[PDB]
Design a binder for these strands. Sequence first.
RNA 1: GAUUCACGCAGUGUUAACGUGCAAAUUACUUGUCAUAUUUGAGUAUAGGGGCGAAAGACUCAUCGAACUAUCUAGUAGCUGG
RNA 2: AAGGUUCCUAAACAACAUUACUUGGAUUAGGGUGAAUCGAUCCUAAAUUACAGAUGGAAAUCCUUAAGAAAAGGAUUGAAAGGGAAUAAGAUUAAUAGUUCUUAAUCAAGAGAAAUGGUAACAUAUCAUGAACUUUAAAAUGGAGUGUGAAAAUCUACGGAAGAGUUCUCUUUUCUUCUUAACAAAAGUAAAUUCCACUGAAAUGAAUCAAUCAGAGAAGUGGAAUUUAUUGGCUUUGUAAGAAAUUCAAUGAAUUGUGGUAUUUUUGCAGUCUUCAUAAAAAUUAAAGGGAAUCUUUUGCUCGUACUAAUAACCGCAACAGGUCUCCAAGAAGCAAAAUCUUUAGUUAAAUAGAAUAACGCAGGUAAGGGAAGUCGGCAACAUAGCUCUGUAAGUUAGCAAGAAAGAGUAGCUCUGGUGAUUAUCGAAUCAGAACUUUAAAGGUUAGGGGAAUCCGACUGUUUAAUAAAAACAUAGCAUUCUGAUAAAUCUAAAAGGUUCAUUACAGAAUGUGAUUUCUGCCCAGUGCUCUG
RNA 3: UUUCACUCAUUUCGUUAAAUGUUAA
Lengths: 90, 73, 246, 105, 50, 72
Amino acid sequence: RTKKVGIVGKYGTRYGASLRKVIKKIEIAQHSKYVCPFCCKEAVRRTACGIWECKGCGKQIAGGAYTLSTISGATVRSTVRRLRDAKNSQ
Amino acid sequence: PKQVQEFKQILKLLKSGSIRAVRVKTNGENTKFKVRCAKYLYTYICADKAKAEELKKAIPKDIHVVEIAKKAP
Amino acid sequence: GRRTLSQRKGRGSIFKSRSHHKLGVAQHRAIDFFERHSTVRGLVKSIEHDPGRGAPLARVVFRNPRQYGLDKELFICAEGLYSGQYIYCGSKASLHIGNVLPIGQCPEGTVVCNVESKPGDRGIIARASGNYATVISHNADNETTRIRLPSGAKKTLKSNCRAMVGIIAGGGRTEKPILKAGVAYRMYKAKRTTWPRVRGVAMNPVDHPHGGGNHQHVGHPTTLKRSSPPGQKAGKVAARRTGLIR
Amino acid sequence: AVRVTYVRKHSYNTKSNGIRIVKTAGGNMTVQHRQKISNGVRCGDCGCVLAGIRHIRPHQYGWLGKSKRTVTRAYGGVKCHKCVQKKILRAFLINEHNLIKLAAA
Amino acid sequence: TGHKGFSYKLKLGKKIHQNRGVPQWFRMKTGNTINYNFKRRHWNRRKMGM
Amino acid sequence: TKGTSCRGTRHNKTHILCKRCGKRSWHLQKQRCASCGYPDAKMRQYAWGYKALRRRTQGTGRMRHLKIALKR
RNA sequence: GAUUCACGCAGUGUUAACGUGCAAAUUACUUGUCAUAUUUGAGUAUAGGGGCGAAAGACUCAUCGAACUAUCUAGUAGCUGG
RNA sequence: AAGGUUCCUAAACAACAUUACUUGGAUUAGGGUGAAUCGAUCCUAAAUUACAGAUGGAAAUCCUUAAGAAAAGGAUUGAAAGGGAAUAAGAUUAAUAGUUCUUAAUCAAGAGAAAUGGUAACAUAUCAUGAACUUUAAAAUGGAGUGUGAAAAUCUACGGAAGAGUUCUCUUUUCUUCUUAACAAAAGUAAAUUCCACUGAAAUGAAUCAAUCAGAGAAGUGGAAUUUAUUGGCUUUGUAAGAAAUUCAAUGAAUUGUGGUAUUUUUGCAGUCUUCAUAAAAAUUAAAGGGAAUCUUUUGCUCGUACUAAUAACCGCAACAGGUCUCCAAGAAGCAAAAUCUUUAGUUAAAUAGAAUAACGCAGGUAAGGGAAGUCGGCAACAUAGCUCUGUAAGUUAGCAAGAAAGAGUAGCUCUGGUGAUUAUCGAAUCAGAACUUUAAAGGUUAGGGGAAUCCGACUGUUUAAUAAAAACAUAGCAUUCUGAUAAAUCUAAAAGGUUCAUUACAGAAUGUGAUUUCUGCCCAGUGCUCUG
RNA sequence: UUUCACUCAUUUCGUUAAAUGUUAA
């Protein structure tokens, strides 16, 4: 169908090759489904910027703007868990 | 307007003291006994001539009876 | 000359905030005994989209520590919160994402958000999408703690200021390139009237200090003192430097 | 075809100005005023449309019979049956756990 | 307009009432100069501006 | 189109009849009368408008009661 | 915020018509455009060294490189007319 | 909305509608607007305005619930297009009618130890008690596109009844009528979605135009509920044939079946897509948690209601080719609400005509041979034009260019075949093919001229109302500066004053450049800005 | 005069002015 312009062929030929490249990565990850942390189903889809909803599972999760979990938001959860364990133990 | 289904209710309605007027209509196939009460206009579709006569005797003489035919009054 | 556009902005006639569909004021609940000396548990009923801001809002429901009824609060979502989650607010709250703790109980290195600059003022710092503040150190002598603001500045607050543990949801919002003028037009649907910005050089000498002559150019340096009156303060203000940074 | 006219003095195709054109004796077509489409009820927890209650205007519920505006169950009319079942188990299991965990463990 | 306030309608009615000519008998009075009403108006000539 | 064509949409009144002075000078959006100075308690009079004073003032009306008192 | 036609709309050209006009800016054909930075009604807000302006010193009731209206005011004129 | 008596009738024509008028939106005199159910009135939106308080020399300004001994919680106003208790059919007037009359309804306010059934989803002509207090829901929510249920219109199949048109040439013919309300009833019978019970799916299945779904349980079977323009969606029933329509006779008589795997419109439903856009509030109503306490009849007030709504009733000095927001919507032909013609309705007059047929014009045309030689310049006009098939380059951000360019076919008539439903009968416009004929076929109307390059602007968009529509403005992208909020910018004479800010650095405010690619060199002396000095 | 400590005018805030401080349990 297309050689390399997969999802950004809807933009035609009018936004610059570099800009169409950057928006392609974000638009693919924004429209994909993610593994739902409570029922382990590929059933989470974005409803609004920052709000993700598990379809066959009935849960609303706050997340990144275009991805369910951000890299910055994942290390922080790891960091707080380590901090809490150290504080709770002595 | 409301429609009564069987013969028992119309006589109970006729014997009831809530009646106001009676109009009888004869059609090409059936006879309708429209009882004008205070609120609704109950009607009864009758196809048996003998049962129609029983109804006509059930009408108290004090009430006004209007007979309608192919020509309206 | 005329009155420039920055002068007309301070009167607030067509530049008023377009806040009609907004959910409300997003903040911590008012401080009380049960938050000072105990913990109150709230339930995250739902996560909603507040117009004009990039982070989602959580409709938390505390109960009523002193009367009968419900205390419907409206928090700013931390990343990872989900519907039906329980969150605890108070001095004895556990160090979990979404919990509200005084900034003195957080271990040094904890990442917080929606911090109160003054005790009980219901949230000031680290409220935009994906933003957070880090606890630097404590000082039990005068009950003060040091935090690192999202701009990099260091600020000292009282050790009993409240904050929510985690990261404000909706991060990475501004990395997606707007592509069309129309898309930028829709961004200010629930904001002020600022978008289509005419360059000062394209105006006339009456309209703007930059309004030029036979060639589109400024003419005088664009770095100005802080003390310039409103009307000529156009461009870089109190600029310690200029040019591309190295 | 017979063309019609608005009967009331509203002249705009608003939500409350909806009409229906129906036939009438003599071949003429008349104009009716149709009611707005309404939503029903929702579970207080899961936000699902409850069964057993009609989708009518708020005031028309008073006209309905006493039994036709609710469902004969605990929290009937405000919570779904699934919503209610979770309520009972939570109230019983947590209370039973409290008797064993604390209260003479 | 079809829709009007009560007070506005009455002020309309007076303007109709005042748009009349001199009665014939008043024109036969001795020393009479009032033959025509110069305050008269018609809908298509002058708008009464109210 | 600043002349003949633009006058087609002029069908929205700005001023309606006032209640204290009876003139079509009550500004609807401003909620004030441009002539007699409504809800303002004092009648609106200006010394630059000397003619506007002689058009509506004492003695330009019926003087229903004042005529008896002064004659008294 | 893809290409086009239509209801509509604008005003590219004829530098056509008219130019004491249908009209104190319109008509005909040609041209363009004709739903998301769209078109549009009512309500409401912003006022003169002010407002509003996708910026032409443009618009603010046929009045705008500072509106309309009245007072100072019969403003002054080494200049023109009588 | 605006106008305001212009509405209807009669008398009358001095003036007015660039001639005239017996006409008139013109003169004179009368008549005309009927509501418990339609609106205003009620609620709140953007916003607006009070007492007290704060500010001001003053006029006055600020504040709208904060400052108050004021207002269980916050005052006034703000929508004839937002929310909203409840009415329809026929008839009637010279003119009013969801308003009058006949018939038939509805709504609100009044008067005369406390239930069963079903496993369950849930169900019961009022039934079957339910206070304070609290919660939930409704009122009350974007847009696009696809599929589909139902009604209406149009078309059509079978069967008719009545009337009309054509008829020396034929035509078992062509046309018209064959209808039904609000509110209720429940013979018969639908589409879609969601739940409940039994059972437990792998050899994985179920399903849509597309999707989508399943051991937190699919498919199957049996049930429950909701929606589908009032009761309960459609046929049917009461109202109701006594009305109405079409005929006939001179007031009285006749008829008023059943369908369609067709098109459009309207109205719902189901899932899909899209947003750094998530697409109102209150009056008002119901339900729940809790357990405090022990059918008939009356009335329904105030205000609007006439008429135009425009090539003559509104705004432009006027009966001005300008301008001004909406609802209903037949046939042909076609992809098409296009152009062109017609039916129902409206009108034949809308600043006067008659004769003659000079020049010069305005509008519409054609033209031998040549073909831009005319001209500042192919300005103007000519020319291409639909659909099908074949074919399509350099360049390129790899998406495009591209309807590239270029070529062929197309009519009429007589036939042939493909694409289904139901179980032999029935039905749809669509495609392909073949003989024959002619005036050799898109062209009545509608309907792209094409190619090779250079400059500017990246693009879609905006702009000097009335001589400039563009290379100008905007734009996305890029970059710089300040600010930790008691701040930055900034309005105000002042102010527990105001805007961004219902905000918090992924933010606010101030600027330059103008998509993408490639790249942004050297200079801190001069003038600015700054310094943690 | 500078540097300190306090609050008591003063500033900026928050709420239904809803457990502040010190003993007690």
